[PDB]
Amino acid sequence: FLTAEEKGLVNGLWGKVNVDEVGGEALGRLLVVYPWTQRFFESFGDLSSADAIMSNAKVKAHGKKVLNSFSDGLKNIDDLKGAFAKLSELHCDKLHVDPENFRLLGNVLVCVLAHHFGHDFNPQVQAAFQKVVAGVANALAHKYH
Amino acid sequence: FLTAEEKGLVNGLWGKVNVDEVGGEALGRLLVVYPWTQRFFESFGDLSSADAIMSNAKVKAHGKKVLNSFSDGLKNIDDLKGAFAKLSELHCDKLHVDPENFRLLGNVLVCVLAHHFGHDFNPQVQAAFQKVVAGVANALAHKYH
Amino acid sequence: VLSAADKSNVKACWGKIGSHAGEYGAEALERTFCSFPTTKTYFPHFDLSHGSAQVKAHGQKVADALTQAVAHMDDLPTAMSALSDLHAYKLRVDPVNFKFLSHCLLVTLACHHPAEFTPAVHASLDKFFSAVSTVLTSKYR
Amino acid sequence: VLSAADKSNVKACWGKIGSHAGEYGAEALERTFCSFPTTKTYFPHFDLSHGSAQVKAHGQKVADALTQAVAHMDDLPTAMSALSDLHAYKLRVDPVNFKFLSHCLLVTLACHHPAEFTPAVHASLDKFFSAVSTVLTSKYR
Numbered sequence: 001f002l003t004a005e006e007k008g009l010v011n012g013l014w015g016k017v018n019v020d021e022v023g024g025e026a027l028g029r030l031l032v033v034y035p036w037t038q039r040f041f042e043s044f045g046d047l048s049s050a051d052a053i054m055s056n057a058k059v060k061a062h063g064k065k066v067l068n069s070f071s072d073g074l075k076n077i078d079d080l081k082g083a084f085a086k087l088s089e090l091h092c093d094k095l096h097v098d099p100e101n102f103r104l105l106g107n108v109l110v111c112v113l114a115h116h117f118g119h120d121f122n123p124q125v126q127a128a129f130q131k132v133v134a135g136v137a138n139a140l141a142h143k144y145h
Numbered sequence: 146f147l148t149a150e151e152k153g154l155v156n157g158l159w160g161k162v163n164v165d166e167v168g169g170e171a172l173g174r175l176l177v178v179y180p181w182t183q184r185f186f187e188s189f190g191d192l193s194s195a196d197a198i199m200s201n202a203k204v205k206a207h208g209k210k211v212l213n214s215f216s217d218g219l220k221n222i223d224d225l226k227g228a229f230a231k232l233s234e235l236h237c238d239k240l241h242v243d244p245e246n247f248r249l250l251g252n253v254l255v256c257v258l259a260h261h262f263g264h265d266f267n268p269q270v271q272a273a274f275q276k277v278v279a280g281v282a283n284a285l286a287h288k289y290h
Numbered sequence: 291v292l293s294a295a296d297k298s299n300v301k302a303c304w305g306k307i308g309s310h311a312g313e314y315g316a317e318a319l320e321r322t323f324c325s326f327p328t329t330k331t332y333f334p335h336f337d338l339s340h341g342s343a344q345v346k347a348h349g350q351k352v353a354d355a356l357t358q359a360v361a362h363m364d365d366l367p368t369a370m371s372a373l374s375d376l377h378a379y380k381l382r383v384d385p386v387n388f389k390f391l392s393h394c395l396l397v398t399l400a401c402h403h404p405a406e407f408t409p410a411v412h413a414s415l416d417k418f419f420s421a422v423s424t425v426l427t428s429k430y431r
Numbered sequence: 432v433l434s435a436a437d438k439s440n441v442k443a444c445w446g447k448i449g450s451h452a453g454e455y456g457a458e459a460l461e462r463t464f465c466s467f468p469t470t471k472t473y474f475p476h477f478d479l480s481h482g483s484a485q486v487k488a489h490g491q492k493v494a495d496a497l498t499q500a501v502a503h504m505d506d507l508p509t510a511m512s513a514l515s516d517l518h519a520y521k522l523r524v525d526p527v528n529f530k531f532l533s534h535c536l537l538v539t540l541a542c543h544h545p546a547e548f549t550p551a552v553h554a555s556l557d558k559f560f561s562a563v564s565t566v567l568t569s570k571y572r
């Protein structure tokens with residue numbers, strides 16, 4: 001699916017990501033920008049404001065598990081379906097998440113990557129990360145039924 | 146990526162299809178239901194009303210070719226990207242069709258199929274043809290660059 | 291935005307359909323769950339099995355609002371304002387799911403009412419179902 | 432639906448972009464054609480190669496329309512009237528494509544103005560771009 005040019009762009013920038021910071025930021029931003037998604041995360045406590053979401057220990061720790069799963073996907077990039085198969089079943093059966101939302105979150109992550117990397121996140125670096133986030137979302141949607 | 150039971154519903158219903166009528170019917174309805182699509186078919190003549198479009202000899206003859214390519218889709222259901230490669234390139238490079246509309250023509254075909262077969266068009270038979278039409282729209286969308 | 295021709299097509303079709311709307315809502319819902327399984331994500335608290343009496347009941351509610359929509363095609367934001375809050379802020383259904391049900395409603399009406407499902411009426415019902423779908427996708431923020 | 436904080440967020444960003452609105456539009460557009468190639472079907476009359484002047488000239492027009500939208504956030508329907516006509520009646524641009532541009536507008540903004548691109552401003556800008564998309568698409572039929 002991805003060319004070695006595309007992977008080198010993606011993995012190269014991914015190597016520079018702050019693993020403790022980025023996923024939490026991507027998740028906090030989903031919750032802030034798209035406030036209907038909060039209802040999925042109500043055991044997480046105070047989500048009453050941007051500042052309250054962005055400093056939530058549980059959003060930060062959940063964002064980190066979300067980020068690690070993207071890293072595993074990069075680690076399994078030729079087989080995203082299989083990498084996300086157990087997570088797909090989970091999001092469907094247990095979580096009742098519309099897979100249309102998987103694209104929302106990937107695009108927030110692309111926005112956080114753009115935020116952290118500025119000029120280095122050129123249109124060609126984005127496009128490759130767009131291929132990743134679309135593949136990720138397809139694979140999470142795949143075991144739905 | 147179809148199942149045997151699905152191919153059974155699909156191929157079974159298709160052997161009863163009226164390529165003479167159903168093709169003309171789906172294309173006509175596309176231009177009627179979704180008037181913007183008409184802009185791609187100015188060479189076809191009078192499209193100024195439903196009557197005009199539904200009586201148009203050009204719409205009917207081109208509608209037959211489209212239904213013939215759907216027949217081609219079925220015969221090659223295991224390799225849609227491959228079968229639809231040339232036609233993907235035509236629609237992108239020559240005709241400039243936003244692949245979004247492919248889904249529209251796929252759903253109109255489904256409606257024309259419902260209208261012909263009434264209650265024989267099971268929810269299961271529909272769901273299987275929904276799978277075909279999405280597959281075909283996806284294959285015709287693949288060579289877009 | 292719905293024309294003069296569209297309103298007469300819809301009201302004339304809704305009359306022929308008549309008292310049957312509720313059962314057509316049911317089947318249109320069934321067809322949506324069947325043809326587009328991702329819609330079932332919105333109904334985890336429903337018994338969704340084939341022929342289930344909660345889907346029947348629900349499709350009658352959907353029908354009810356649409357008949358009420360047929361009467362109020364000049365001002366649809368007002369007459370669907372309770373559903374509008376329910377769908378864009380309360381539950382929040384992604385707009386693509388409306389395209390799914392809208393299509394399946396046309397499927398159902400084509401199967402049940404062939405003489406009515408003319409090219410011109412097919413066109414007007416599309417316009418009407420997505421004018422309903424637009425009101426419903428309102429209060430997101 | 433634009434709040435008071437959204438409005439000051441939007442005008443804050445728009446002031447910081449300042450004279451570079453056109454370049455920001457041009458970049459959002461290249462990001463759009465690059466990450467979402469189906470958008471190029473609307474511009475077959477364009478040179479879309481890297482560094483295109485035709486794309487850059489169009490970036491300014493896109494910026495100028497958003498500049499007018501920023502000035503008239505209280506009534507975007509009225510201010511974007513002719514543009515709604517163009518994208519609906521004359522060009523008929525599928526709604527999905529507005530989503531691709533809006534997303535690349537955010538990405539361009541995040542790339543250029545990290546100190547301004549806070550979670551709340553990210554939210555206010557998303558609301559605005561989407562307020563504008565809805566107007567521009569409102570006359571879909």
Ligand code: HEM
Pocket residue numbers: 037040041043062065066069070087091095097101102103105106136137140
């Ligand atoms: C878009 C790509 C997504 C990825 C890669 C992802 C990944 C994950 C992962 C790794 C977990 C943890 C499960 C475990 O560690 O066993 C999880 C849980 C969860 N996810 Fe997602 N997710 C995505 C999208 C979404 C979206 C869009 C929503 C809701 C709108 C959502 C809702 C949830 C919820 C509610 C949990 C459980 C949280 C808890 O109580 O611990 N996910 N996801």
Ligand code: HEM
Pocket residue numbers: 182185186188207210211214215232236240242246247248250251281282285
């Ligand atoms: C999604 C399924 C579709 C299929 C399978 C399909 C198939 C075909 C085929 C087989 C041809 C060649 C006919 C010939 O010239 O011999 C063709 C041509 C063409 N198609 Fe499509 N098509 C699809 C969708 C669309 C849509 C949605 C549009 C426009 C909105 C479109 C616009 C055109 C145009 C403008 C031509 C050239 C017609 C002419 O000038 O003769 N197609 N298509």
Ligand code: HEM
Pocket residue numbers: 329330332333348351352354355356373376377381383387388391419422423426
């Ligand atoms: C023309 C389109 C639609 C109409 C007219 C409509 C109308 C309605 C009505 C009348 C109710 C009942 C509320 C009440 O009276 O208490 C309802 C509830 C609901 N709707 Fe829709 N709806 C539409 C589309 C959708 C879609 C596409 C979805 C997502 C798949 C959806 C999901 C729901 C859910 C989850 C409820 C809660 C009802 C319950 O839990 O019993 N709706 N809607």
Ligand code: HEM
Pocket residue numbers: 470471473474492493495496497514517518522524528529530532533563564567
């Ligand atoms: C932020 C949303 C958008 C804004 C503010 C916007 C604004 C504009 C403006 C100012 C013009 C020039 C009109 C004139 O010069 O009188 C225009 C034209 C045009 N727009 Fe957009 N636009 C938007 C989104 C889109 C999208 C998403 C597409 C399709 C992918 C699109 C396709 C076009 C095309 C093809 C033209 C004509 C270009 C030409 O023929 O030279 N627009 N738009």
